[PDB]
Design a protein around this ligand. Structure first.
Ligand SMILES: *C(=O)[C@@H](NC(=O)/C(=N\OC(C)(C)C(=O)O)c1csc(N)n1)[C@@H]1N=C(C(=O)O)C(=C)CS1
Length: 261
């Protein structure tokens, strides 16, 4: 059956709500499912915060190497990199890397604080023409993912469009675009998500997120061996607060929409 029928069936089996946007950059075609509906981004929002700092670095050649003091009081619920550096410093570049490649929540908070608060991340998204994205809170509370709560949400299509702009398009100057792509390609947290639904040897950059309501997300740029890149957002959320996260659904969605590519 059709891709749309396959996605609807996946959602029907899932016990939740699935959002997919794939952009095929060969022809700008799209595979869209609930793509204009809002989902909690959870830690996928870290891409926007890191990119906002990269944008600033365009016009400040010392920014990425700027020291940031890490204190015990900065630690939150999940901070495997920052905790190694308590009482020392990390650079803004190191905080970008930690936020993106390990989903270090303390690192995300340092980026947000540097920028001047969640609303500055929203303003950066808007500067890229993304009217949908909003960041409202710091970590960990940006991951509460309560159904119908607009805070810290976007739509799959808005995020796919912005991720394409960030990684392959016009958002960032070249050195900064390349840095973002390097970070995403080196992600350690995404093995079981979009990547698991794709050929093992395809190059992928991604950022995952997970929150309450079993909210399980991944946003990716995918480089096939013989085809133009694909940009893929897979968001998934469930009705019950303490639902298990479901990375397998993201892998399954990725397999469905990349068939034939
Ligand atoms: C981003 O999504 C972050 N998520 C969280 O901090 C929340 N939970 O995530 C973990 C701890 C993995 C979970 O048990 O689901 C969270 C904060 S408030 C709330 N109700 N939940 C980070 N993201 C990931 C990721 O999947 O990318 C992590 C690897 C580290 S936490």
């Amino acid at each position: 059956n059709s891709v749309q029928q396959q996605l609807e069936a996946l959602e029907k089996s899932s016990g939740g709500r699935l959002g997919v946007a794939l952009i095929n950059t060969a022809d700008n075609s799209q595979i869209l499912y609930r793509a204009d509906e809002r989902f909690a981004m959870c830690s996928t929002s870290k891409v926007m915060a890191a990119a906002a700092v990269l944008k600033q670095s365009e016009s400040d050649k010392h920014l990425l190497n700027q020291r940031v003091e890490i204190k015990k009081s900065d630690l939150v619920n999940y901070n495997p990199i920052a905790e190694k550096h308590v009482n020392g410093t990390m650079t803004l570049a190191e905080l970008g890397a930690a936020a993106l490649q390990y989903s270090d929540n303390t690192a995300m908070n340092k980026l947000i604080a540097h920028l001047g608060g969640p609303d500055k991340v929203t303003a950066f998204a808007r500067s890229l023409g993304d009217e949908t994205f909003r960041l409202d809170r710091t970590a960990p509370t940006l991951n509460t993912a309560i159904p119908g709560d607009p805070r810290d949400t976007t739509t799959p299509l808005a995020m796919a469009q912005t991720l394409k702009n960030l990684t392959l398009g016009k958002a960032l100057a070249e050195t900064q675009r390349a840095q973002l792509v390097t970070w995403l390609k080196g992600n350690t947290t995404g093995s079981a998500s979009i990547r698991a639904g794709l050929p093992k040897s395809w190059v992928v950059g991604d950022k995952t997120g997970s929150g309450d309501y079993g909210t399980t997300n991944d946003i990716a740029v995918i480089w096939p061996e013989n085809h133009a890149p694909l940009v893929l957002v897979t968001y998934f959320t469930q009705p019950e607060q303490k639902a298990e996260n479901r990375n397998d659904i993201l892998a399954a969605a990725a397999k469905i929409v990349t068939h034939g590519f």
